[PDB]
């Protein structure tokens with residue numbers, strides 16, 4: 127068991143501390159196998175690894191600024207949510223004072239800490255990540271995004287956008303399947319059983335199209351934007367017939383229509399990245 | 404097993420090829436001659452007329468351009484289809500699936516309607532799905548042979564289900580892919596933490612999609628029960644973080660329409676007093 131300090135005992139902070147304790151680490155906490163101290167100065171002095179999980183980065187700076195001298199030679203893992211610039215500014219300050227800095231984001235809620243298949247994403251000091259990965263595994267599956275401390279904040283936002291696109295298309299499909307009409311009156315649970323299997327194919331599409339974006343070359347092969355637009359129009363008609371009004375078909379047909387007007391009808395879906403950036 | 408394929412366009416030709424690769428005695432027919440040469444070289448028996456093809460096998464797999472084409476081909480063969488099983492993988496509307504199923508019933512053919520959830524090059528490969536609805540006897544008796552095309556799923560007894568499932572699953576795909584595109588553009592943009600490649604983002608997104616899948620499985624029973632407990636991720640938190648996504652996307656020049664769609668939808672549910680509920684409550688605000 128390694129020595130680890132947690133700063134912040136809100137619902138998430140308290141969950142982080144409990145996961146470290148459960149893995150057998152010598153856990154000091156500040157806001158019963160944990161050692162609770164009254165001051166953050168005492169908490170920071172107790173451990174070479176300081177895991178921070180406060181409400182805001184403004185709170186981070188209020189807590190950590192008076193401890194600049196006390197942070198020399200320590201490793202700071204900052205799981206507070208906030209902006210990319212705030213992660214970067216905190217990283218630069220930590221470097222100034224000789225603390226190894228790793229910024230991270232928690233891709234679950236407190237009840238998911240310590241459970242399988244939940245991600246915590248980190249960016250910043252590679253030496254901090256490699257040295258602390260074994261202890262950080264107590265919280266969930268750690269991923270090292272790279273060396274730029276601000277990356278984790280951007281990844282969280284982008285990944286939530288992906289989640290909301292998926293879940294909104296799921297809701298649209300649930301409503302289409304549940305509606306009255308031939309082939310309808312299907313439960314959400316039955317639809318989702320098939321959807322679960324289908325997502326493996328959707329994952330093939332995302333892994334096929336990422337190289338297209340990075341190359342700036344978008345070969346349509348057997349599923350061109352012409353075919354997307356045609357079948358999107360079917361989706362729109364079907365949704366109107368069955369009373370599903372989500373705005374997704376209107377968004378899809380407008381976006382693909384602009385690429386087709388521009389002459390890229392034979393390209394893959396990846397071409398559409400040029401029409402949102 | 405003896406199987407007939409009617410239709411040798413790109414998809415139908417792929418279906419016949421997959422039946423051949425699984426060892427089935429495969430008979431093929433197409434309206435235009437001269438599209439079965441490669442299949443014949445792979446062991447298919449090509450015949451000149453649809454009547455010969457239907458006569459050749461107890462299982463008749465149909466993959467034509469439209470359901471109008473299906474009826475042009477099958478209607479003269481009503482008496483010849485009695486006692487056979489028709490599996491119709493043609494694309495079209497739920498009503499056309501039902502009308503064809505009713506016609507098959509009248510003439511004594513067991514009818515299974517289906518949809519192919521891949522392109523011709525995906526036929527016969529792992530993970531790709533073929534979805535079927537209609538005669539449970541047809542599905543159970545034919546599943547072993549149909550396995551040659553891809554993983555078969557029996558959606559249930561109503562022939563029109565496959566058509567609706569295809570449309571619904573494509574909507575789910577587009578929602579996912581448009582959220583993925585939005586994320587690629589946000590990750591790739593200039594700014595702190597940015598200039599990340601789409602390939603690097605997608606490697607992380609692949610792992611994240613497992614969690615997203617868990618959300619869908621948690622929320623499906625909410626829809627079916629009409630009870631939407633928000634637990635630790637309520638609509639209040641969705642709306643708050645959606646506003647962050649909208650702000651971030653504007654600063655980095657990502658203009659997809661998705662944040663505005665999300666915040667308007669969640670805002671309507673919060674105004675209605677459902678801020679403590681799960682994402683599943685939003686089904687009531689699109690239906």
Ligand SMILES: NC(=O)c1ccc[n+]([C@@H]2O[C@H](COP(=O)([O-])OP(=O)(O)OC[C@H]3O[C@@H](n4cnc5c(N)ncnc54)[C@H](OP(=O)(O)O)[C@@H]3O)[C@@H](O)[C@H]2O)c1
Pocket residue numbers: 133134135136137138139157179180181182184185188189205206207208232233234235236635
């Ligand atoms: N909760 C989740 O589901 C979840 C999921 C992913 C990420 N996160 C992130 O994890 C972080 C914390 O989670 P949380 O929601 O449990 O924390 P929180 O509820 O948002 O705020 C509670 C914690 O922040 C501390 N704090 C706030 N302002 C402070 C200040 N000026 N000085 C010292 N401490 C201060 C609180 O201490 P006091 O209030 O006692 O002063 C308490 O420890 C947040 O950034 C959140 O976005 C949370």
Ligand SMILES: NC(=O)c1ccc[n+]([C@@H]2O[C@H](COP(=O)([O-])OP(=O)(O)OC[C@H]3O[C@@H](n4cnc5c(N)ncnc54)[C@H](OP(=O)(O)O)[C@@H]3O)[C@@H](O)[C@H]2O)c1
Pocket residue numbers: 348409410411412413414415416433434435436438466467468469471472475476492493494495519520521522523
């Ligand atoms: N290709 C795909 O990626 C894909 C994916 C999923 C589902 N599907 C569905 O699978 C079906 C076939 O796909 P496909 O592209 O390979 O075929 P297709 O291009 O959609 O149409 C070609 C087939 O339809 C036949 N056909 C059309 N009109 C006919 C008529 N009046 N009488 C007799 N036969 C007629 C053609 O015979 P001729 O050669 O003589 O014209 C040929 O066998 C379609 O419903 C398609 O939507 C296709």
Ligand SMILES: O=C1NC(=O)c2c1c1c3ccccc3[nH]c1c1[nH]c3ccccc3c21
Pocket residue numbers: 207208209210279280283589594647650651652654655
């Ligand atoms: O407050 C913010 N201002 C921002 O610009 C911003 C902010 C937050 C934020 C605030 C509280 C909790 C979690 C958070 N995530 C954030 C962001 N992610 C991004 C990705 C690209 C560009 C900008 C952002 C961005």
Ligand SMILES: O=C1NC(=O)c2c1c1c3ccccc3[nH]c1c1[nH]c3ccccc3c21
Pocket residue numbers: 307360363364365367368494495496497566567570
């Ligand atoms: O109403 C429709 N008219 C159509 O032509 C149609 C319709 C629906 C539909 C209506 C309500 C719910 C789910 C639905 N799926 C549909 C379709 N899928 C196709 C594939 C190829 C050609 C046409 C279609 C097609």
Ligand SMILES: [Cl-]
Pocket residue numbers: 300301304305626686690
């Ligand atoms: Cl519903």
Ligand SMILES: [Cl-]
Pocket residue numbers: 306307308309
């Ligand atoms: Cl009905």
Ligand SMILES: [Cl-]
Pocket residue numbers: 311312313316559
């Ligand atoms: Cl059902």
Ligand SMILES: [Cl-]
Pocket residue numbers: 322323
């Ligand atoms: Cl699955």
Ligand SMILES: [Cl-]
Pocket residue numbers: 352353356
């Ligand atoms: Cl097309």
Ligand SMILES: [Cl-]
Pocket residue numbers: 449450451
């Ligand atoms: Cl011939």
Ligand SMILES: [Cl-]
Pocket residue numbers: 339399403587588591592
């Ligand atoms: Cl980009």
Ligand code: NA
Pocket residue numbers: 204205206207208213229230231278279
């Ligand atoms: Na962070």
Ligand code: NA
Pocket residue numbers: 491492493494495500516517518565566
């Ligand atoms: Na069909």
